[PDB]
Design a protein around this ligand. Structure first.
Ligand SMILES: [Zn+2]
Ligand SMILES: [Zn+2]
Length: 315
């Protein structure tokens, strides 16, 4: 074992360059590194508020990316185009880091490693795929079982379960993975007190954040996906008013250009797993907001080569 190693059991920027090289080259991080970072981040994440509140001062900027779902080479591509994470190049990854892609283990531990390395500048928000269920069917678990063991999987699970549900910036812009609410009158003070450390329930607010979609016509519909709902432009506009917000960024659904703006400006979708599943031809992008004009700028990019492992391989 000549693989990458923690200095003084604790992640560092050159461990990370190192993990990235190692992972580019399809090798495995050693179990006990895997294990250390997972326990460390359980720790970090777990004293985090369910609702993350961050402040971009006038001259800072932060990048917000959505699904990446195991397309690790395209993750590295993100970093090459936009820079490494660092205290001056902060990231939010709005969930779905795992599943479907065949380099989810690569994704997630790169992800947790930067979390460990830049805790107040590198943000992870829970997807609906950071959950046991999606995990048993779309590939994560098979993947972990194949490269480590069940044990290492349950540890992952326990970790995910501490992932914040949503993050607001300058009490102007709020980001979650899925969307807004099945019921009205939900406030930021509500999201804060969601006791998040569980598999999501069937319904209630924590379901929604993880699961709902926008629709174009005013109102709410049952979600074509079996859980939560589609909320209309009224729903969004109602919630922005109660809470005093400018608009929301969310992910969850693929997009032929890698973003959409729905709801009249009010509800933005970024999605950062290009040519999602080696199939859909799509563009991805990510978003730069900066401290003095929190308006989205959208940066497109498209999928690079990755090695010949098939989507879904581990399910
Ligand atoms: Zn999703
Ligand atoms: Zn997704």
């Amino acid at each position: 074992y000549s693989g990458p190693k923690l200095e003084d059991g604790k992640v560092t920027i050159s461990f990370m360059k190192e993990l990235m090289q190692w992972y580019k080259d399809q090798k495995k991080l050693h179990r006990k590194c895997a294990y250390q970072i997972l326990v460390q981040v359980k720790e970090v994440l777990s004293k985090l508020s369910t609702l993350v509140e961050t402040t971009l001062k006038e001259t800072e900027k932060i990048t917000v990316c959505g699904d990446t779902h195991g397309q690790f080479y395209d993750l590295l591509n993100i970093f090459e185009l936009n820079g490494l994470p660092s205290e001056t190049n902060p990231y939010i990854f709005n969930g779905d880091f795992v599943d479907r892609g065949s380099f989810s283990v690569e994704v997630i531990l790169t992800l947790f490693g930067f979390k460990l390395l830049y805790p107040d500048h590198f943000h992870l928000l829970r997807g609906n795929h950071e959950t046991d269920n999606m995990n048993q069917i779309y590939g994560f678990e098979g993947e972990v079982k194949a490269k480590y063991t069940a044990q290492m999987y349950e540890l992952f699970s326990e970790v995910f379960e501490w992932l914040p549900l949503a993050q607001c910036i300058n009490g102007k812009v709020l980001i979650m993975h899925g969307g807004l609410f099945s019921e009205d009158g939900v406030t930021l003070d509500d999201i804060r007190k969601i006791e998040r450390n569980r598999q999501p329930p069937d319904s209630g607010p924590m379901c929604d954040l993880l699961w709902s979609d926008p629709q174009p016509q005013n109102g709410r519909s049952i979600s074509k996906r079996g859980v939560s709902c589609q909320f209309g432009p009224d729903v969004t506009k109602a919630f922005l008013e109660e809470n005093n917000l400018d608009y929301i960024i969310r992910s969850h659904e693929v997009k032929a250009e890698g973003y959409e703006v729905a709801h009249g400006g009010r509800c933005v979708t970024v999605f950062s797993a290009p040519n999602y599943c080696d199939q859909m031809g799509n563009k991805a992008s990510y978003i730069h907001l900066q401290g003095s004009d929190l308006r989205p700028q959208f940066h497109q990019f498209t999928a690079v080569p990755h090695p010949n492992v098939k989507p879904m391989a581990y399910a």
